């Protein structure tokens, strides 16, 4: 519980923010049959074009202003596309002789938007949010949207609206206001208001993922973010458990404890529980990869291209396991029982580290030939999968930023899974449907089984013939679950926003919606 | 066309050999339940131990000859195991006095045989094959396979065994093969399939094996007339000047720094009845790349296996063999491979150049090693005006498929589901394992060139498999089209040789669709 | 014994060392060609050569005690097979007494003189055949021409490849062990002296096998000299076990800045035999023993360094254990061997020892670091100094020192250097009896004006000349002022990569030298 220190003027806390100015935000939802009413502050429309390559604008809503209705007739929006990403900033005043603002976002002539075009769509909103001082947004839906993309459109318009300035002190914005209301007209209302509250929980989810992967490794420990992981149980009213060094030795979490002996902060293990009001029928165990910050070991990432400054983020499996459980938490799903684990420790280089060549004892008994320090992510998620299949689930998945052959794969957009079960795969490809989280499923080729054959432990830790990391990694795992349906999310490649500069906070909402629909 | 050399000393045409042993041998298929005759030869059995891993061998057939009867009693077949891949035999006297061998090769404690296990099972049986001199070989089948798997043995089997020596300066071949499995009376009909699937694959790895000196562009495209001569098939070979009035200057300018013209090779096999289905075949045809003046002499590049870059194109020959011996129904296919040599020279083309493709798009050349696309995408627009219903291209583009699927599984990438779902099909039936990539439409934002209408490779997105289908999607405009990238299978690194990848899907392609 | 420390309960406190392997249980029984063979249960090989004809038909020339098996194995049935160096073949049959029998052969090529790694292939097959097959006895007919050395090579080799180091498996495991070895060889009275000295020279290989392959978390500063001194009470050896503060009292500067950044205290093995009559003859066995090589900040981070296999940095010191059994066990007279190591471990630490850093050695010598992974002549020229002090007429030093020796000799020949005719022939003579090879290298003393440090007295590392083992030779040369010092360098040769396992390189070699003096 207590976090160690070097130096007096080292943290001992990560720095979280639970009441952010999005939950400050009234969201109401109005039918666009009745029409709209343009009163104050930034009124947006997302407007479509069908066929045509970036054609004309045209505002199709019944507006109850005959100023800005004058304003906003086809014979004046000659010079407005539809090209996704444009905007415009109109000026007015009203009928009541009140200066308002109007504006439309381009959303292209594809009927159907994308994940990646959405995201483009919002991004543009908040462009037209920041350097302005409003009180009240409106958008209007002049295209179809379901209902899964609705609530992704307020998600991330949540998420990329806030700014993070825990560490901010001489450099804060000073022009940084908040809207304070959110209005929205859109097709049929009423089968879209049920999404309002279950985006804002899906923000703050993924919010506090990022939170966490963005504070950095002096701040995020493995004390420290075990202390976070019981705040959070106790204001959610979960069941935590957090495993010392001394029962991890009882338990012989050898792999484990191997990767954290060279580290000043002793190994956390986080088990928080929630279990369901009613009969369970399903037991699931999340797994989340939790390495406070991965200098490679003895295996230093000295190389050019191994981004050395980023391996805070090696937790960040961890933090999308612990963002899912403030979802599932608050939204309180039930006829199931989670458990959301991580084996947290952070691989340093020491006196006290282990070696390249080291043969460690994991927790089912079987011995490891270790071949390169920086592969220190599949040791500890042996221990943490074994721990995790006597929990006696029905579905064991973990998550973890493992092989940068990830972005040589699939790149930064789309994450991969692996796993020995098809309907657990085919589950969770259709939760990153709804959850608009892109996955692809990889293969787990038996033929490279070969080469993790060692000499002298019973298996190695690397191949060093195959260079297909990501394929060999889960030829690893795939050794510690001998009975339980099980799959492995890749995420080292997309979990950073290299172009954002900031976590993306991925897989909190598809963990949490493969939660919600089993 | 005439070879240029550059002393009388260089090789002007790739030897090919058409007739190999393997075409002499008598294969027999025999029913396992009446039993085994092992009187001849060399008799070995495939038995597993399913349960006990590392178990005992037993073998459960009769055998006529009382001593080998004797020979496999299992108080003498216990003190072996059958790990997978295990193998011992024995030389003995049969009943009448005769030099006969007998032995086994492990299969496993695992029922159902994967691909790769079969080839482990089979270069078992390759290593004593190469240490035997008798004229007989007996393979009796004690475990379960459908023969999409024992073509596919039979297939290995003649790979394997066959040995390639066209350049080189203890072990006779086999006159028979007999065969015990259960069902033989349906497992006739894949033995002839077989060897023409072999032969694909061989004369494929024939032209890939054979280096840069012999296989170039001229004389490549001299070995496919002659193949198409053979075969009866229809055959057109493009010139400079032909191509160079088809407008194709992407293609023509990888080959600029070569000695060798480029040649453009366009075989055709036409159906005797209606065409209800037509087909074209693209394969990236470069017999050798240096890399240009962006050189390959990074460590890793592996300059000195850059023979294989014709490997695509192999394939496709490989492919126009087998369509031309089993002479598919109502089909129309198309084997085309725009075939070039990447070389260094005064004459070459330059990092940054721009260049126009034969579909009027400007490229901005961002890495001379990245060749392959530029002359697939020439290739794609030829494709395209045949009016065909498919387009399948196979290359060995980018040496990142080592990092994502490894040498085992090749990527497939397309515009069309339906085509990619065919391709999936026929690598179940071919038993060349392929696994499906996405062509991610987020990425296709950083080939925007600043000065020309595309850019040939990223700058920013690390993930060169799919930037580069991204790239050859712009050049298939209304065709179904899907793309086999090949770099990470085409070459058995730890045998030294290539697998002929891709000659039993394509054929299993178009003789299945 | 000193307590070995720990960051976890899980880390390991003890090498695991297999004494009593399935080898020393194998019955070996010796007979005369000149009397016939009997082909009994088991498997019967026969070593069989063609001398000029390559590649040539098989003939066995030696009598089999069978009517029915001379039948199967006349000239105009071996025929069909040749004697390819590596071919082998099986052959099932029935004997006089109606008795189902095994027999084979393993090709010897032509060449008629085989050479240690022709043997060695010749011995490999003939493991191939052991392997995967559950034989009771195994009997080897030499109808190929052998000396008594390359004789006892055979069946080292043999002892060594059969068997399996399954110390580290738990999971993991499988099937046996033959029980008796028969040999029919011409003159057989003459070889079978070599038979228990093949066994002996046999698990001296095998234990050093076991201390190289055993991890750095297992085999370590502390768990090496606890077996060192475990090996000496079982042979009745007097030992030394140096910490820290004698090492600081001896002034070994050199020594004890390398492990500085360890968590595990150096410890320095000394190790003494002791002959009952009169002594002629004093030698001093010195060992790299660096149980884990990281480079320490000059850290082992180009591809090439090959830092996961840097448990081996420690081979030098298991080859002089290796060789203190086989010394301890065949008892040689009116000789004194020390057997010395400078123990400990080379890593990155608040408490490492810097490039640049100065220190000075226990001879006075100020030493100027310029490369921290070049720890293994800091510490041999301590051990040195050390050795020479005993008062010793010979100083053989074995260390894996510079991966040069990959470019120079490779990973057959290792390299000998030395100041003095004899020592080095008197080894290079003990490399032929021993059938482990090595090669002569110079010390150019040319490049001995590169080691001059502008402030300390000698720099460790030269600035010009790439030629390393040439240069650490020379700087090992400046700790031996009067005695006779020979030094070889095994850093090429020590692992064998494409077996993924160590060799034990030394132990047979050393021990020929004190045998053959
Ligand atoms: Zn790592
Ligand atoms: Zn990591
Ligand atoms: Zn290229
Ligand atoms: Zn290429
Ligand atoms: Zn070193
Ligand atoms: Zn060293």
Same mark, same amino acid.
């Given at each position: ?27 109401? +939802? ?7 009413? &343009? ?14 390559? *970036? ?5 199709? #809503?019944? +507006? ?22 444009? #905007? ?41 949010? =920041? ?12 295209? @179809? &949207? ?14 990329? %609206? ?10 804060? $914005? +000073? ?32 919010? %506090? ?46 792999? /484990? ?13 986080? =088990? ?25 070991? /003895? ?26 459980? %403030? ?7 039930? *006829? ?15 006196? *006290?580290? %282990? ?8 927790? *089912? ?54 796993? @020995? ?18 996955? !692809? !499923? ?11 054959? #060692? ?40 979990? !950073? ?19 919600? $629909?089993?």
């Amino acid at each position: 519980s207590e976090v160690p220190q070097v130096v007096s003027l080292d943290p001992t806390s990560i720095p979280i923010e639970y009441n952010t100015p999005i939950h400050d935000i009234k969201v109401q +939802v109005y039918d666009i049959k009745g029409g709209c009413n &343009v009163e104050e502050g930034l009124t947006i429309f997302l407007v479509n074009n069908p066929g045509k390559e *970036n054609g004309p604008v045209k505002i199709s #809503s019944k +507006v109850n202003d005959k100023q800005v209705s004058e304003f906003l007739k086809d014979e004046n929006m000659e010079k407005f596309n539809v090209k996704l990403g444009t #905007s415009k900033h109109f000026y007015m005043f009203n009928d009541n002789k009140n200066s308002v603002a109007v504006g439309y976002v381009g959303c292209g002539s594809v009927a159907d938007l994308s994940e990646a075009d959405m995201k483009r769509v919002v991004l543009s909103l908040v462009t037209m949010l =920041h350097d302005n001082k409003l009180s009240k947004l409106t958008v209007v839906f002049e295209i @179809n &949207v379901d209902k899964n993309l609705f609530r992704f459109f307020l998600e991330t318009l949540f998420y990329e %609206y806030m700014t993070d300035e825990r560490f901010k002190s001489t450099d804060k $914005n +000073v022009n940084m206001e908040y809207i304070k209301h959110l209005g929205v007209y859109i097709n049929n209302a009423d089968t879209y208001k049920e999404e309002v509250e279950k985006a804002r929980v899906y923000y703050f989810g993924t919010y %506090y993922a990022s939170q966490l992967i963005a504070a950095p490794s002096n701040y995020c420990n493995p004390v420290s973010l075990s202390n976070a992981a019981v705040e959070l149980a106790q204001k959610l009213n979960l069941e935590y458990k957090i495993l010392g060094v001394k029962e991890l030795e009882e338990l012989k979490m050898g792999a /484990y404890l191997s990767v954290g002996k060279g580290s000043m902060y002793p190994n956390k293990f986080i =088990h928080l529980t929630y279990k369901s009001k009613g009969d369970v029928k399903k037991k699931i165990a999340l797994v989340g990869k939790g390495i406070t910050f991965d200098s490679g070991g /003895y295996n230093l990432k000295a190389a050019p291209g191994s981004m050395i400054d980023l391996m805070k983020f090696d937790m960040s499996g961890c933090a999308a396991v612990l963002g899912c459980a %403030y979802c599932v938490g608050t939204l309180k799903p039930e *006829n199931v029982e989670i458990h959301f684990l991580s084996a947290v420790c952070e691989n340093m280089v020491s006196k *006290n580290s %282990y070696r390249p060549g080291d043969i460690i004892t994991a927790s *089912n008994g079987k011995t490891i030939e270790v071949g390169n320090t920086d592969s220190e992510g599949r040791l500890t998620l042996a221990d943490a999968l074994v721990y995790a299949e006597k929990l006696g689930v029905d579905y064991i998945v973990d998550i973890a930023t493992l092989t940068g052959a990830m972005l040589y794969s699939l790149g930064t957009s789309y994450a991969g899974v692996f796993g @020995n079960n098809e309907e657990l795969i085919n589950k969770i490809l259709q939760s990153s449907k709804t959850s608009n989280e892109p996955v !692809w !499923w990889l293969p787990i080729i038996n033929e490279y089984r070969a080469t993790l054959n #060692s000499k002298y432990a019973d298996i190695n830790q690397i191949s060093s013939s195959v260079k297909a990391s990501s394929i060999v990694a889960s030829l690893f795992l795939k050794e510690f679950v001998q009975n339980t349906a099980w799959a492995h999310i890749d995420i080292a490649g997309v979990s !950073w926003n290299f172009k954002a500069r900031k976590p993306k906070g991925f897989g909190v909402r598809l963990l949490t919606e493969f939660v919600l $629909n089993d």
